[PDB]
Design an enzyme around this catalytic site. Structure first.
Site, PDB file in Angstrom:
ATOM      1  N   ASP A   1       0.817  -1.226   0.000  1.00  0.00           N
ATOM      2  CA  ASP A   1       0.000   0.000   0.000  1.00  0.00           C
ATOM      3  C   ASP A   1       0.848   1.272   0.000  1.00  0.00           C
ATOM      4  O   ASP A   1       1.330   1.693   1.037  1.00  0.00           O
ATOM      5  CB  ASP A   1      -0.917   0.009   1.231  1.00  0.00           C
ATOM      6  CG  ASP A   1      -1.810   1.262   1.295  1.00  0.00           C
ATOM      7  OD1 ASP A   1      -2.013   1.870   0.224  1.00  0.00           O
ATOM      8  OD2 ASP A   1      -2.309   1.626   2.386  1.00  0.00           O
TER       9      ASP A   1
ATOM     10  N   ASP B   1      -2.132   5.319  -6.172  1.00  0.00           N
ATOM     11  CA  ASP B   1      -2.346   4.502  -5.000  1.00  0.00           C
ATOM     12  C   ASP B   1      -2.592   3.021  -5.279  1.00  0.00           C
ATOM     13  O   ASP B   1      -3.533   2.648  -5.984  1.00  0.00           O
ATOM     14  CB  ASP B   1      -3.491   5.085  -4.202  1.00  0.00           C
ATOM     15  CG  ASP B   1      -3.587   4.481  -2.851  1.00  0.00           C
ATOM     16  OD1 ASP B   1      -2.884   4.877  -1.915  1.00  0.00           O
ATOM     17  OD2 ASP B   1      -4.335   3.536  -2.691  1.00  0.00           O
TER      18      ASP B   1
HETATM   19  C1  LIG Z   1      -2.398   6.535   6.418  1.00  0.00           C
HETATM   20  S1  LIG Z   1      -3.623   5.193   6.368  1.00  0.00           S
HETATM   21  C2  LIG Z   1      -5.235   5.916   6.802  1.00  0.00           C
HETATM   22  C3  LIG Z   1      -5.833   6.511   5.524  1.00  0.00           C
HETATM   23  N1  LIG Z   1      -6.969   7.341   5.916  1.00  0.00           N
HETATM   24  C4  LIG Z   1      -7.243   8.636   5.278  1.00  0.00           C
HETATM   25  O1  LIG Z   1      -6.539   9.024   4.411  1.00  0.00           O
HETATM   26  C5  LIG Z   1      -8.449   9.493   5.744  1.00  0.00           C
HETATM   27  C6  LIG Z   1      -9.189  10.217   4.589  1.00  0.00           C
HETATM   28  C7  LIG Z   1     -10.462   9.788   4.189  1.00  0.00           C
HETATM   29  C8  LIG Z   1     -11.131  10.442   3.146  1.00  0.00           C
HETATM   30  C9  LIG Z   1     -10.533  11.526   2.509  1.00  0.00           C
HETATM   31  C10 LIG Z   1      -9.267  11.957   2.916  1.00  0.00           C
HETATM   32  C11 LIG Z   1      -8.594  11.304   3.953  1.00  0.00           C
HETATM   33  C12 LIG Z   1      -6.252   5.407   4.549  1.00  0.00           C
HETATM   34  O2  LIG Z   1      -6.964   4.525   4.878  1.00  0.00           O
HETATM   35  N2  LIG Z   1      -5.741   5.446   3.190  1.00  0.00           N
HETATM   36  C13 LIG Z   1      -6.125   4.442   2.213  1.00  0.00           C
HETATM   37  C14 LIG Z   1      -6.332   5.169   0.866  1.00  0.00           C
HETATM   38  C15 LIG Z   1      -7.524   6.161   0.898  1.00  0.00           C
HETATM   39  C16 LIG Z   1      -8.763   5.776   0.375  1.00  0.00           C
HETATM   40  C17 LIG Z   1      -9.842   6.668   0.404  1.00  0.00           C
HETATM   41  C18 LIG Z   1      -9.683   7.936   0.959  1.00  0.00           C
HETATM   42  C19 LIG Z   1      -8.456   8.326   1.479  1.00  0.00           C
HETATM   43  C20 LIG Z   1      -7.373   7.437   1.450  1.00  0.00           C
HETATM   44  C21 LIG Z   1      -5.068   3.314   2.171  1.00  0.00           C
HETATM   45  O3  LIG Z   1      -3.951   3.672   1.399  1.00  0.00           O
HETATM   46  C22 LIG Z   1      -5.701   2.121   1.477  1.00  0.00           C
HETATM   47  O4  LIG Z   1      -5.581   1.978   0.302  1.00  0.00           O
HETATM   48  N3  LIG Z   1      -6.484   1.138   2.174  1.00  0.00           N
HETATM   49  C23 LIG Z   1      -6.841   0.905   3.669  1.00  0.00           C
HETATM   50  S2  LIG Z   1      -6.915  -0.564   3.837  1.00  0.00           S
HETATM   51  C24 LIG Z   1      -6.818  -1.188   2.204  1.00  0.00           C
HETATM   52  C25 LIG Z   1      -5.346  -1.581   1.965  1.00  0.00           C
HETATM   53  C26 LIG Z   1      -7.694  -2.441   2.042  1.00  0.00           C
HETATM   54  C27 LIG Z   1      -7.174  -0.174   1.360  1.00  0.00           C
HETATM   55  C28 LIG Z   1      -8.632   0.090   1.138  1.00  0.00           C
HETATM   56  O5  LIG Z   1      -9.316   0.577   1.967  1.00  0.00           O
HETATM   57  N4  LIG Z   1      -9.208  -0.298  -0.135  1.00  0.00           N
HETATM   58  C29 LIG Z   1     -10.622  -0.198  -0.453  1.00  0.00           C
HETATM   59  C30 LIG Z   1     -11.101   1.146  -1.055  1.00  0.00           C
HETATM   60  C31 LIG Z   1     -10.874   2.462  -0.677  1.00  0.00           C
HETATM   61  C32 LIG Z   1     -11.456   3.503  -1.428  1.00  0.00           C
HETATM   62  C33 LIG Z   1     -12.289   3.213  -2.553  1.00  0.00           C
HETATM   63  C34 LIG Z   1     -12.522   1.888  -2.923  1.00  0.00           C
HETATM   64  C35 LIG Z   1     -11.936   0.854  -2.187  1.00  0.00           C
HETATM   65  C36 LIG Z   1     -12.025  -0.682  -2.338  1.00  0.00           C
HETATM   66  C37 LIG Z   1     -10.868  -1.210  -1.529  1.00  0.00           C
HETATM   67  O6  LIG Z   1      -9.751  -1.306  -2.386  1.00  0.00           O
HETATM   68 NA    NA Z   2      -3.738   3.125  -0.635  1.00  0.00          NA
END
Ligand SMILES: CSC[C@H](NC(=O)Cc1ccccc1)C(=O)N[C@@H](Cc1ccccc1)[C@H](O)C(=O)N1CSC(C)(C)[C@H]1C(=O)N[C@H]1c2ccccc2C[C@H]1O
Ligand code: NA
Ligand SMILES: C[C@H](CCC(=O)NCCC[N+](C)(C)CCCS(=O)(=O)[O-])[C@H]1CC[C@H]2[C@@H]3[C@H](O)C[C@@H]4C[C@H](O)CC[C@]4(C)[C@H]3C[C@H](O)[C@]12C
Length: 327
Positions: free
Chosen positions: A32, A212
């Site tokens: 990630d 990302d």
């Molecule tokens: C320093 S980690 C905490 C971070 N939180 C934030 O940025 C808070 C935020 C929220 C909304 C707007 C701005 C900021 C975060 O979770 N970032 C994530 C990316 C992100 C996504 C939306 C909005 C802001 C940031 C992370 O890199 C990721 O890919 N994650 C966290 S866990 C994961 C590895 C499974 C994956 C995931 O959730 N993926 C799901 C996702 C996310 C958004 C849209 C679709 C999907 C499906 C699935 O792929």
């Molecule tokens: Na991400």
């Protein structure tokens, strides 16, 4: 250059494997770029999600260094919690002592966790994004002089056609055809660049675009999405922010992203997900509406499936180039 094979999981996500502990305890990670911490589920896990996972056992590692400090990682998809620990982390043939989180509770990360086959998440972001102030793996390997450059590379697998590689430390010409275009980061601590976004007649100039690896979608500002979908013959799934379409839908647009330096496009074939089980010739869009404080697109997995990408800490840049259809 050290390489880590990347396997596709049902064309939504990908994983690569790495080791934590001198016991050679082997773990499957989501890799990630948008987070900056490493975690693995512990043998001390109290939750059902840990049942089917490779679990970390610090009592079987002689390079384990205790650090009791309690921590939780709050993701957009949920929360995991536990404590910091230190041990030898091995990525490909590159090892370094490293601070990571030993997760004992994954209940807040359901249903994502029990659904998929990954054990943990390995962050590839910037240091100021980490909890506990952890130097990123690639920048330490650089500093320790185990790799030429403070950079890593993504050549993503494609479902039913080939595997992928995360390459650390240097850029391999074999992964891509055409020119490799570098885009300067517009932020200190995110893989975020400035691009004009075009979908048909809808345009956002100088939009923030986050490259990302952990997001399975193109995310789009909600107002921009609502305009895109006007008369598109697409239908929202009840209670969920997902749209369904005929795969063949002639109106589905091509995203066009541009800088002074380059032009990157994303055609329907890269953002559609066949859902033949739900119905014949139906597809889901891998596009989600999401508003950041400043208008932003996440160029997730679907972008990275088409484009090879170079994440450069030293040059504060993202290199982008068309991926080769196979190696
Ligand atoms: C320093 S980690 C905490 C971070 N939180 C934030 O940025 C808070 C935020 C929220 C909304 C707007 C701005 C900021 C975060 O979770 N970032 C994530 C990316 C992100 C996504 C939306 C909005 C802001 C940031 C992370 O890199 C990721 O890919 N994650 C966290 S866990 C994961 C590895 C499974 C994956 C995931 O959730 N993926 C799901 C996702 C996310 C958004 C849209 C679709 C999907 C499906 C699935 O792929
Ligand atoms: Na991400
Ligand atoms: C990140 C965005 C927007 C979140 C948002 O708009 N939230 C407002 C409330 C904010 N809170 C008050 C709770 C706290 C912050 C306030 S504060 O001002 O302090 O920042 C939310 C909205 C819909 C969410 C997806 C769907 O569910 C479907 C699916 C469920 C899985 O399980 C995980 C994956 C997935 C794709 C989800 C990911 C992500 O999760 C989405 C995109």
């Amino acid at each position: 250059n050290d390489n880590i094979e990347l396997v596709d999981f049902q064309n939504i996500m990908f994983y690569g494997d790495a080791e934590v502990g001198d016991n050679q305890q082997p773990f499957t990670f989501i890799l990630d770029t948008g987070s900056a911490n490493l975690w693995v589920p512990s043998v001390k896990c109290t939750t059902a999600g840990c049942l089917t996972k490779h679990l970390y056992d610090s009592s079987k590692s002689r390079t384990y260094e205790k650090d009791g400090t309690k921590v939780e990682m709050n993701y957009v998809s949920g929360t995991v919690s536990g404590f910091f620990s230190k041990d030898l982390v091995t990525v490909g043939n590159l090892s370094l002592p490293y601070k990571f989180i030993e997760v004992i509770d994954t209940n807040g990360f359901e249903p994502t966790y029990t659904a998929s086959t990954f054990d943990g998440i390995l962050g590839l972001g910037w240091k100021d994004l980490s909890i506990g102030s952890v130097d990123p793996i690639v920048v330490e390997l650089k500093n320790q002089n185990k790799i030429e450059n403070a950079l890593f590379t993504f050549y993503l697998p494609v479902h039913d056609k080939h595997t992928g590689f995360l390459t650390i430390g240097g850029i391999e010409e074999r992964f891509y055809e055409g020119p490799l275009t570098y885009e300067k980061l517009n932020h200190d601590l995110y893989w975020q660049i400035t691009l004009d976004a075009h979908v048909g007649n809808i345009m956002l100039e100088k939009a923030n675009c986050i490259v990302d690896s952990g997001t399975s979608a193109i995310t789009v500002p909600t107002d921009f999405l609502n305009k895109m979908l006007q008369n598109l013959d697409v239908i929202k799934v009840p209670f969920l922010p997902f749209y369904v379409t005929l795969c063949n839908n002639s109106k589905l647009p091509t995203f066009e992203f541009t800088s002074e330096n380059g032009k990157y496009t994303l055609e329907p074939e890269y953002y559609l997900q066949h859902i033949e089980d739900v119905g014949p010739g139906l597809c889901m869009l891998n596009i989600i509406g999401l508003d950041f404080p400043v208008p932003t697109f996440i160029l997730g997995d679907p972008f990275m499936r088409k484009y090879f990408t170079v994440f450069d800490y030293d040059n504060q840049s993202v290199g982008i180039a068309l991926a080769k259809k196979n190696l």
